[PDB]
Amino acid sequence: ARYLGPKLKLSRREGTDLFLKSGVRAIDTKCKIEQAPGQHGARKPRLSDYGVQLREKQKVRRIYGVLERQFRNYYKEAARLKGNTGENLLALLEGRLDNVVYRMGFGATRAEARQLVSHKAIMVNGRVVNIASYQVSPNDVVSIREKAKKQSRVKAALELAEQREKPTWLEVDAGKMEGTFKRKPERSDLSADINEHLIVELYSK
């Protein structure tokens, strides 16, 4: 139910930096980010039409840490919902509790955030929510509870975030350690490199 292996390998495979490590130390120093994993890394022949789409899908999934069935479900939901499908999917992905936490800066990585969520550190509207897939709504305040507020990791995460660009769709307080999910993010607010359309196509086989 989770990917427990090497994180940088995934990144290498993808091509890009997936942000699977905190960002204290640059990704180029930790691993050969350009070279693909395994014995046959240096060889890089152009991929197929299907293959590129698949890769794209993987990238997105990897980024958020969502396994396949769940991803499929999300896609379906997006399709069902009104408006642009890929965009909807992206929004849904964002909405995940762990992701939100990460954005806020209470977790160094998304993985860390997820872990925190699991371990009953986070509350959503003053009620302890344990599910990483929990879809956080507009105007839903989300905070660290008083037990987990003393942790050194949390402050480190916050610091890291502060170095990292702040998302417009949230509003977080470092002292209070509570952030308000103000609105579901627009496509423009998210990263431009993610070809959602490819993903959509893949499932529209």
Binding site: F19, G23, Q163, E165, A192, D193
Partner: protein, 50 residues
Amino acid sequence: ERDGLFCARIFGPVKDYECLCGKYKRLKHRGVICEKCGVEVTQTKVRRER
């Protein structure tokens, strides 16, 4: 330095049409600013006027 005298977000990217840190290495999306870079995306002489 981010963000010191010679910043990225306040002024511009050292390299032309490149995020100094890492995204956009072609000519498609000139402008996007990710959180991992806190960088604009324009010309090499854009910092001379800013």
